[PDB]
Amino acid sequence: SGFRKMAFPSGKVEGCMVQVTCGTTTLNGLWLDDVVYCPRHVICTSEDMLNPNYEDLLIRKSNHNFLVQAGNVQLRVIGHSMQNCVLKLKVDTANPKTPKYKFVRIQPGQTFSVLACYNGSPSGVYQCAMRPNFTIKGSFLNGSCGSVGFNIDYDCVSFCYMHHMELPTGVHAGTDLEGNFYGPFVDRQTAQAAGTDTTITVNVLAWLYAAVINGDRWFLNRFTTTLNDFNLVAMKYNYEPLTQDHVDILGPLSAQTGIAVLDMCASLKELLQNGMNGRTILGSALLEDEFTPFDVVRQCSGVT
């Protein structure tokens, strides 16, 4: 009973957080095996950020200029390299708390947990979604750079995000763990605008199925629709177009509730057209799009 914006247990990632300082800049690093991953802008001063030439700036940095602190002890840096927008610091000690892990590049619409950190220490954990415009709506302040986004499948942590930047609109941009930015953003102090933040239709549908499973059924109507008719409505309301791939992954939710995906689409269509009329669904007065079909199944079945 009940439905919450739930994050993965953060312990396995907490044991990986370290603090990386280079000159007078301090941010968070991720220590996995004998490597510490961190945003490359750790080598920059505030002046460098206007137009940094990271290859040129890195020439003036040696292994001893990278101070890595895990809790209260100092890691010895025996190597360094730049991979896209991340620095990889080879240390002389494997992280004893390194969990089983993978580096994955997620697609927009996918969700993940964020362990927000400052000076190598965790402050909190929350659930996020990679927006269709490749930004994330996080909760990050100066010093949160290097905080990571991840998913957990039983014992394996799949790292998918490393936080780098705050756009002038208060939305966040970052990279996968290979240092490639999500979206068109660059690690530079230059105004970069985000594209249309459309709503993740498949996720709103998954959340409507979760509401039905939990007893919120007022929005169920006597109607059905087609993918093409639905998508005309989705386009008008800046919702992502729904495909048969999306319908396929909503199948287990359709099977559990007995509500055909296209019938749920017709309920969503009427909600978009009429609004909630002062009503709520799962304690929300708007349509929630940061639960994937997988998140709904996991939460509703108790996967640990």
Ligand X SMILES: Cc1ccnc(N)c1NC(=O)Cc1cccc(Cl)c1
Interacting residues toward ligand X by CB under 6 A: 1, 41, 49, 140-142, 144-145, 163-166, 187-189
Exposure string over 44-58, b if 16+ CB within 10 A, otherwise e = beeebeeebebeebb
Q: Distances from the Cα of 178 to the Cαs of 61, 83, 212, in angstroms?
A: 21, 6, 39
CB of 123 to a copy of itself, least distance (A): 4
The least distance separating a copy of itself from the CB of residue 302, rounded to whole angstroms, comes to 5
- Asked whether position 78 contacts a copy of itself by CB under 8 A, the answer is no
Q: How far is the CB of 59 from a copy of itself (least distance, A)?
A: 33
Identify the bridge partners of residue 199 per DSSP, sorted by sequence position.
239
181 scored as a contact of a copy of itself (CB under 8 A) = no
Residues in the chain: 304
Look up 145 and say whether it is catalytic. Answer: yes
Q: Is 163 a catalytic residue?
A: no
Q: Binding partner of residue 246 among a copy of itself, ligand X, none, CB under 5 to 8 Å per kind?
A: none
State the chain's maximal CA–CA distance in angstroms. Answer: 68
87 DSSP assignment: E
Q: How far is Cα 121 from Cα 115, in angstroms, rounded to an integer?
A: 10
Q: Which tokens belong to 97? A: 């708390």
φ/ψ of 29, rounded to 5, equals -125, 160
Q: CB under 8 A: which stretch of 38-46, 198-206, 260-268, 273-281 binds a copy of itself? A: 273-281
Give dist(CA 270, CA 129) in Å, integer.
25
Could you tell me the smallest distance in angstroms from the CB atom of residue 65 to ligand X?
A: 19
| Binder among 37, 112, 118, 291 for a copy of itself (CB under 8 A) | 118
Residue type, 187: D
Compute the least distance from the CB of residue 136 to ligand X, in Å. 10
The item of a copy of itself, ligand X, none sharing an interface with residue 158, based on CB under 5 to 8 Å by kind, is: none
The one of a copy of itself, ligand X, none whose footprint includes residue 192, by CB under 5 to 8 A per kind, is: none
Rounded Cα–Cα distance for residues 144 and 38 (Å): 11
Q: Which residues are catalytic?
A: 41, 145
Q: Residue numbers of the site for a copy of itself (CB under 8 A)?
A: 1-12, 14-15, 115-119, 121-126, 137-141, 143-144, 166, 170-172, 214-215, 275-276, 278, 280, 283-286, 298-304
